[PDB]
Amino acid sequence: METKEIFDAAPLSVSQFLSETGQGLYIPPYQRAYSWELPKIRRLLSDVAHGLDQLAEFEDSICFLGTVIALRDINYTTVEPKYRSQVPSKVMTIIDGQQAMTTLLLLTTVLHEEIRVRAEKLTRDDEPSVWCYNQALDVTGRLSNCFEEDMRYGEHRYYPRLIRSYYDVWSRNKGEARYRSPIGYYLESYGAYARDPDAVKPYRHVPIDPDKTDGVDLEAYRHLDRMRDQMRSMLRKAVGAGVKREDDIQLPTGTDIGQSQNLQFALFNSEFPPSVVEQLEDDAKMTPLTRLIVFANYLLHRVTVAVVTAKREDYGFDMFEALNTTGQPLTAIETFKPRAIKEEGLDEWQESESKLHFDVVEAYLDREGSSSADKRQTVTSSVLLPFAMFQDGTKLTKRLNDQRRYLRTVFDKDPDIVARRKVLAGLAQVARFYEGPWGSPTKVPSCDDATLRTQAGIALAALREGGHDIVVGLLTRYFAAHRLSSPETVESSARQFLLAARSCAAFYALWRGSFGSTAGIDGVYRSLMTHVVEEGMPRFARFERDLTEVPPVEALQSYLKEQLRSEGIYDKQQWVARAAMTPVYQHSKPLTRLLLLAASQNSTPDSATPGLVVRGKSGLLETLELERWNDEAFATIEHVAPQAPSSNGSWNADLYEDPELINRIGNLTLLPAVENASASNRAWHLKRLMFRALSAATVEEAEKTLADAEAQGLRLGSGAGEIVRQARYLPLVAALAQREEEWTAEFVEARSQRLCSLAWDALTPWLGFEP
Amino acid sequence: METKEIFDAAPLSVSQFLSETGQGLYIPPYQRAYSWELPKIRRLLSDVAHGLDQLAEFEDSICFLGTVIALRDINYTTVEPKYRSQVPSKVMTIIDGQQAMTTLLLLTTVLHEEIRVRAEKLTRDDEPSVWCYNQALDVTGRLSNCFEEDMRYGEHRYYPRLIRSYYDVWSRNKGEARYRSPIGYYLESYGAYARDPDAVKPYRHVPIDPDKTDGVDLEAYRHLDRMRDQMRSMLRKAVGAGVKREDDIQLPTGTDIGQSQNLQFALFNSEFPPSVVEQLEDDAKMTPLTRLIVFANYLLHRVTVAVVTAKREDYGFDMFEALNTTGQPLTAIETFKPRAIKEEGLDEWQESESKLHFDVVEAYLDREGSSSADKRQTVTSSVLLPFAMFQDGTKLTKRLNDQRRYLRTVFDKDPDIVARRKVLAGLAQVARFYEGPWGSPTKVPSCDDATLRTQAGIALAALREGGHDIVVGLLTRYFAAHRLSSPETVESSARQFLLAARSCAAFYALWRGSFGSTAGIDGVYRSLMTHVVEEGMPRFARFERDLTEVPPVEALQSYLKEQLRSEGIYDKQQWVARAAMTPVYQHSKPLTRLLLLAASQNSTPDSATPGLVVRGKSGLLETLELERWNDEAFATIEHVAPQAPSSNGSWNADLYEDPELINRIGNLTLLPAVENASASNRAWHLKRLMFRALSAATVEEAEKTLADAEAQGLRLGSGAGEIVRQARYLPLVAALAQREEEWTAEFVEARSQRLCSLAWDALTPWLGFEP
Amino acid sequence: METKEIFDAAPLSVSQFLSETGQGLYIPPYQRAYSWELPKIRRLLSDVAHGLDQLAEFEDSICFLGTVIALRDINYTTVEPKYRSQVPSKVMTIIDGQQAMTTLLLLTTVLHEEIRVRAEKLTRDDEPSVWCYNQALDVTGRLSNCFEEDMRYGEHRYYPRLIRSYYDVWSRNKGEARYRSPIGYYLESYGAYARDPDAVKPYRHVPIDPDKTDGVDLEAY
């Protein structure tokens, strides 16, 4: 008695864990039911998908999957409704991980379904096609004995794994056998479906309680069933179409597989026959299935869980406790500091560039982290992905090992010094960038061009609010060059940077203006940072090379435009066509602010059409100024027609057959003061008056219309907010007080058309338009 | 590649982990410095001490200590400034647990220190004495080769364990060996002290940097040095004096050890010689040693750490991550539901007494827990310690295994059912007490005596604020009988209960009033729930028995009084002597509220001495009503003489010779409206005026004195808060406005004396005083 | 119960085998006496010498020594006249191999003797010579904790390894400790010589029965 067993750990692939010939995984009777909301599931699939994708590169990288701590219940004292007659020969009552475990088994069930049915759609006379048929069969069987295990006799001849006590008893005889838990039921019913002779139809599922089983919540069954089916969908959508939405689950492609030898050996113990690397090179009708098979094999043999087996139940609990108190793993920066202490040069570094740089990074991390520990890591990620754009041009992930690995890779490229401490200077400049124009954008840099300063200042403050960190690469890349240049070429830098800022705002506004989403833009900027620019002169995002240098000022503009062609559309007609019909308030409200501010650039109320607006005053009151983003003069996105009219205060239902109408530009303006809090809103008459208040060019009409609207009750809430003697010029709201008629739907169409045309006119000079 | 090592875990006693003959534990160069603040150290020691204490009971209970994950650095690739000639033959660069480890080594250092020098004070001529010296010798050496290790030649012939990289190189040669980290330095110098012949003094310690080593913080050495010396002091204060403060670290006593066969077998592989159990039974100069020796021997052989070993470093980090994802260990109530599902009677329970009870308990936990997870266990403790008082009479600890154990122990005594499901009715009733009079005390029970209701209501609302949960047993015990009674004996029950509440408030009011602390009270109430009361009629806290029955109504009072004797003092004279001189505001502020509301019970401003108060109005305005605790009429504790007077606003330093003066009754009253928030305070004149304001019995003295004090400025902060036409009677503030003279210390003593006498008068009838 | 331990095998070097911080190797009482006539000893030594010679060439070649099968006597049911007060904490009654083990301990004893005494003839002032003294020192001790083990108090403070039942009781106390078997007595006496200060004379050996011990044959001795 000292280590007298107590406990017992080993690593196992999901295949060797799940498919052990005489085993049952048993959910003991104090566990909650299945929880994991889909986000955890997606992190799950995407971790294994990343492990596999990184297996092509690193031939030994093994991906982990957590721990399961379980009781090797030897005298079956924990299987609480049991038929000892024939309980399985090794039951493992699962103390923790039982959730991950449930998820896994289901994942196998979906993988089995797909690989089977896609494998039957296979033309078995192609030589490669038959290979892919054979290989599918293989994985099919190997997923088969992964979730069920063939006891040899009886009805209910097959046992699941995972079971829950109380609902579900393992047995193979004809009475007496239940599988009524969510996971128990699911595994039974899938398993029986798989054994349908004459099957090959995809899996339906007939959820339970034909008239019974309220020993669980009925809500639990709903959840588990839904989880399984949504992984089924996730995976299905991961090899199929081309919509390729940002998350999804990226597993390597037909060409990827086809050309990675190491992936081939480590998952099929052999090199592919050449006819298959050919058929794969261009997906060719069998590659979705083959991608599903590669992913399935990786899941079997290369995702490994840590299995901790105690012999007594109480030791198991004490173990659970002892492993819940296990320290605070460190950011990839911390675990990487050594590897540059150990290049400067020996250990004698304290007045040595890298220290300074690192001190910078470290300052930022302690400043903006500190508060907790995963806040510290969320900050380290914020300074690490933009850098991965910057000093290399690759999309870094939010998983620890990746930040560790990429940082190793990049630091150990230019194996010298002066080069390596430039690599560190990158990170430093990035943290300082986040301190300058992103803390309070008003610093930007210096330079004259006093319109440029507050114009790129609006660009930044709008890029910050509402995501678009994909840009923080580029801009830091440029923000670097303003501090790295022969004291003469400060002013050149200051301009390039400022223009870049402005151009990235515009392309932001356009790209999300027309489409509904950050659709490609991240990947488009990624291509921008990799693509060859002007023969061999440079590369877009400082890539080795030399920090000060590269690219120019403007190759951004032309490339971004060249892409605004393609699947972008950039003719004001085509563009305003797309953008007039996209709910901008539904997306980012800061996008809609930028767009409204760009559509009211030195603008004036239109007379020919009452309620539109037109330009032409060169410098009336130019709004694309950072002092006017924050300008809480006019700083509220007010819908003309409200989103909520639950009993219809009146209004025109023209506007609501299509619920995206209420959310286009033509339905919004920038209203000072009140939103929906102090004094605001009503139905389109009180709204007309409210706009009519804020538009008068004399107080011998401001006081007058303040009183005009107090009859119906303009002083709503008390006695009107900051509403007595308001000056202030608001061109959109003017020609909105000038429209009587009514709030027709056609009018929002023409209005959003008008505003988009104006904003496009106002901004497209920011990419310097001629394409 | 499937289990290709990846990792490799085992359990080891701290002795087998630390003192393996060729091993060196290495703190790699990215670990933080030594963190562990003293709360965590105290948890560590009490964890092991609890382990020992529970080994006496259960001869097999093995105690854990967490995990250490380390890289078995095989080619010394992580020993970052090294001399391979003689790096140790196995290094274990610790990826996680290194802080746990640092503490562990320090602990061995102190246990070795104490056992060394105390064993020298042994008269070795005495048989038991020599057994003890020998036993000391054994553990001494076995701790020694625990922290350092004998390489066999050269200066620096001895190697530490734990080392930190960069600072510290293991070697044995004469230049070249450094141990300059905090721990490196500590283990070196401590061991050097241990190897001093002609020593046997206790260890002084000379912290580092005779003029150097400023690659670290200088605070690092400070924290660690201090932490060691305080584990030293902790243990010293665990076997030495008799102060026995609430925390300390409880390890078993000479007799405890002396009589537990299992403790001796399991730590000394043999039964003690009887001459030793004899000398031990009554400490006798040698028992502190043997308690320290037994503590160290349990630490050595029965604390077991989980050791996880990777061969690659990145496998180590990925493992660490995979173990930071380790579930949410469950409340002892969850893990106990099964074992009462399986006595009711079989699995057919859904309409079967116990279900009811659990539903109660579960509901309460789900209601007020919920929000988080450690809130859920905190709430499960709040219902389990008082339950442990009710159905048994024991102090449960807040630790998981103890709750599990006690729940199993208690539930399985009377092995029947109706005995057991009564045991469960216990828990349910504790939850319901938490739902009746503790959620809002205004429920109380039914009954007439409508004065009992608000009197016991202030009792409860006063016991709740300011801790004093030790009572929750008793009262629940009673609250059950009010809900379980032959429909006639409801009003009897209802009365017992209400009076019970009052009594506990009174005893509470008294006990912390006279003492400075809840010194005995916990033990006193535990004594009551165990003490035999009236032969074999019942037992004070339902102990098996039968829920409705027991105890009486009033044995509470008699026992509480009988103990108010002993080390209590209860003669009005003696009690006011103690209580006049205990700064009650320093202790629990609800204690001062209870005392002032009892001291102003229909109280009247005293004329004979300007500023005291005297009683006698039987029903003037009686304050001991739950309606008057919340009564934010008079609900602000105002010090007459302020706690803040850093430069003396003027005031009298007579009161500040003793910092406990400012916080006695005689400097406090109950003030309405403002504390120090709206309009408040100043120097003793303005304070006089403020008291004179609220005491006006006419409006033509209310307004007149409102303006009087605005001359000096009563409207402080803006213009006097809720201060215009205030009726409201506060007898204390009048005779505080009736003292001119000055605010002397002699007067504060007299005033606190008077108030204390009065409150004692008001309350001691709540225990039905005659003793 | 299918592999429920039954058995348990591993390789260990003679160092990590012999010098386990808390182990005692016990010759159970049905084993014959020490037999190995000198040719078997000579093979033992030439095997270890050959393995070492073949280590220069093949940097990985590891040399074996046969097998020991032993019972991890956990409740000390086989240590036949025992003082449980202080039996070693882990005994291993050798079921097979006890003769190879007898030889091995004897081998360490003579290697310790030679390296010790030749290292004292070292002029400790010569760089290599001091390199070589230290190195002797290292090995010397690392062979000591190989054959005996320092329980930490009493007379008969040191425990052998290997012991035979009936003859020989591990204890560290002053009555009550016997070592009278051939090997028990040898390792005891050798250990004593080793720990002699002021020695560094080669080992004589003053064999048993100052008047006693015909509980074995005297020929075995």
Residue numbers in the entry:
A (entry chain A), B (entry chain D): 1 to 771
C (entry chain C): 1 to 221
Kindly provide excerpts from the paper associated with this entry:
In the PT-based defense system Ssp, SspABCD confers a single-stranded PT modification of host DNA in the 5′-CPSCA-3′ motif and SspE impedes phage propagation. Notably, SspABCD coupled with SspE confers resistance to a wide array of phages through unusual mechanisms: (1) SspE is a dual-function protein that exerts both N-terminal NTPase and C-terminal DNA nicking nuclease activities to defend against phage infection, and (2) NTPase activity, including GTPase, CTPase, and UTPase activity, is stimulated exclusively by 5′-CPSCA-3′-containing DNA in vitro. Here, structural and biochemical analyses reveal that SspE is preferentially recruited to PT sites mediated by the joint action of its N-terminal domain (NTD) hydrophobic cavity and C-terminal domain (CTD) DNA binding region. PT recognition enlarges the GTP-binding pocket, thereby increasing GTP hydrolysis activity, which subsequently triggers a conformational switch of SspE from a closed to an open state.
We then determined the crystal structure of SspER100A, a mutant with both N-terminal GTPase activity and C-terminal nickase activity deficiency, to a resolution of 3.48 Å. When the structures of the NTDs of SspER100A and wild-type SspE were superimposed, the CTD of SspER100A was observed to have an en bloc movement of 2.6-3.9 Å toward the NTD domain. As a result of this conformational change, the R404- and R408-containing helix moved away from the NTD, yielding a larger space for DNA. Given the conformational difference between SspER100A and wild-type SspE, we next wondered whether wild-type SspE underwent a conformational change while functioning. Remarkably, the GTPase-defective SspER100A mutant bound to pUC19 DNA as strongly as SspECTD, whereas SspEK40A with enhanced GTPase activity bound to the DNA substrate with a Kd (22.2 μM) comparable to that of full-length SspE. Therefore, a tempting speculation was that upon sensing PTs in host DNA, the GTPase activity of NTD was stimulated, subsequently promoting the dissociation of the CTD from PT-modified self-DNA.
